[PDB]
Amino acid sequence: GMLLSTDIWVAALIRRAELGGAFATVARKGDARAGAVLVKAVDRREGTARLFSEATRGDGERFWMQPVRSTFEPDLDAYAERAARIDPDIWVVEIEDRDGRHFLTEPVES
Numbered sequence: 001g002m003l004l005s006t007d008i009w010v011a012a013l014i015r016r017a018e019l020g021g022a023f024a025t026v027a028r029k030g031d032a033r034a035g036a037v038l039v040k041a042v043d044r045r046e047g048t049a050r051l052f053s054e055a056t057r058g059d060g061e062r063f064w065m066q067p068v069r070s071t072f073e074p075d076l077d078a079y080a081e082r083a084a085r086i087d088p089d090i091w092v093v094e095i096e097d098r099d100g101r102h103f104l105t106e107p108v109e110s
Contacts, residue, residue, distance in 0.1 A: 007032035009105075010091050013039070017095050017103040024103070028084065028092035036090040038080050039064060043100035050100065051076040052108060053083065064108035 017024030042049040052064040068079045
């Protein structure tokens with residue numbers, strides 16, 4: 001199949017997000033092989049936001065879930081501190097888009 005890495009997705013993701021016309025950036029740099037990833041998505045057009053985390057299935061089959069069922073700005077931004085106090089080396093990617101876009105190559109939940 002293929003063999004991506006943590007750095008690879010955060011590279012690709014930033015490039016595509018900026019391409020759409022977001023102020024995307026990486027805000028934490030976990031392990032380049034074996035690090036987890038967060039993706040926050042802030043809609044400055046409407047004045048809304050959301051926040052996504054990776055998750056995996058029984059098979060290690062991966063998705064982007066949203067483990068913070070709030071839309072309040074501090075509740076969200078606090079997650080992207082919180083996680084890193086228990087996750088071993090976790091990345092943070094921030095997508096200040098227009099239309100709350102995420103530019104992720106992968107399945108994402110609601």
